[PDB]
Amino acid sequence: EVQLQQSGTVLARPGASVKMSCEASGYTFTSYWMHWLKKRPGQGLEWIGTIYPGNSDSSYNQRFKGKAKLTAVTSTSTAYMELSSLTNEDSAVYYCTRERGLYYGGRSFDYWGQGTTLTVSSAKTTPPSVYPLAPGSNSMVTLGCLVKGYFPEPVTVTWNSGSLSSGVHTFPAVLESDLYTLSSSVTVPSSPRPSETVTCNVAHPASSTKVDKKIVPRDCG
Amino acid sequence: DIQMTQTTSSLSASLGDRVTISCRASQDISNYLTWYQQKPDGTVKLLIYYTSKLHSGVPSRFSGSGSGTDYSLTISNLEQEDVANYFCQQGNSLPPTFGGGTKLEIKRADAAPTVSIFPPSSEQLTSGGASVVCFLNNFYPKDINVKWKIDGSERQNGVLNSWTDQDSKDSTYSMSSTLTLTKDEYERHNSYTCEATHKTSTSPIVKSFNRNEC
Ligand SMILES: C=C[C@H]1CN2CC[C@H]1C[C@H]2[C@H](O)c1ccnc2ccc(OC)cc12
Predict the structure, then answer these.
(1) How many Å apart are CA B144 and CA B104, to the nearest integer?
(2) Residues A131 and A185 in one domain
(3) How far, in Å, are A158, B19, B29, B78, B79 from residue B16 at the CA level?
(4) Pocket test for ligand 1, best of A35, A51, A59 (most atoms within 8 A of CB)
(5) Is the domain of B21 the same as that of B119?
(6) Which domain holds residue A39?
(7) Which residues of A touch B99 (CB under 8 A)?
(8) B142 lies in which domain range?
(9) Which of B74, B113, B129, B165 is the most exposed place for a label (fewest CB within 10 A)?
(10) CB A146: neighbour CB atoms within 10 A?
(11) A187 and A91 share a domain?
């Protein structure tokens, strides 16, 4: 089974340089052309370049020439890509892939890595603020959990430590002035809460943050 | 570069149906077209190369055809495991170029959105900001429009929306609409409304509250 395994997410400020790897297995590394691709949310999939680990012969997209350097180490069957002078446009998910065709390749890419995320940002590691979303007076009732102003991704939200899986919606994060924000909803019957405790648990690994915001009905009168 | 287009970004079908994904090139690519499958996993797999040649390990219900600029991928008997994003590439000219992809969604009965609105917490106001969050959960089709009304008037500034992918469990969609402003501005208005337009309702589904209650 041909398998590529790329390196983890990379955070970098503008002007920095980074290096991501791609470890191949299940075949002879030196005998197939490797390629790198860039997936940015606005564009389609873009071609960076390619290297033949046999003799390190390479070819580059003219747009990434001087931006991306490509290397391959025969010893550890590992391809590398270097990215220099990072800017906001360099933010993307980068894929390494193998070209079909022994020795001389073909016109397709027959095996793929899972991808590597590169986040270009000057934002500092910031814990999330977590806010209870209570109703404001049916068989069911929906509660919420607002997670605001954190960096970087990811954040993890659960309800009653995960004991509430069904009826949960957690939405993709969005960027507002260099920080991330999202919300999570949970629907339970109208039976078990105001009466039983409902609690959202927000975790932010990067900052080592764990907060539990118990949902309690609004204070008015 | 040769440009690859996939006019249909999302396609509706049912399990067991015949599905056809379309691909177009900005010029003749001489049958040098290749198809890929990107599952929710984020994993990519090769299916078909050179217009119609099956890659080893690919099920036979997959097939491809086309010539000149127009090409297509076909699935004879759609299974739940075939629900993914399908995109093409031309291999006629370097650099290789790809289409935006076509994401498969599963058909189901029209379901109205469950709309819920939430005034900002008192805890949040101590920060200086004020987020009015509106959930619209478990609706179908995906087509939906969300409007924020303040004291009667429409509002667009400070509104960020966020959509989930199609939930496999019930084939529905959900979205959050969040309106964010200063505490000072929030405290200077009364009626905050979140109304949704959708196929299941002639009249918009309106969810609102008056700040001056709680
Ligand atoms: C990019 C450079 C190398 C990678 N492949 C092997 C040697 C070099 C050529 C290319 C392939 O033969 C090839 C030839 C001609 N037209 C092509 C068009 C697309 C393509 O995508 C994999 C590969 C092509």
Answers:
(1) 18
(2) yes
(3) 35, 9, 32, 5, 6
(4) A59
(5) no
(6) 1-122
(7) 44
(8) 108-211
(9) B165
(10) 26
(11) no
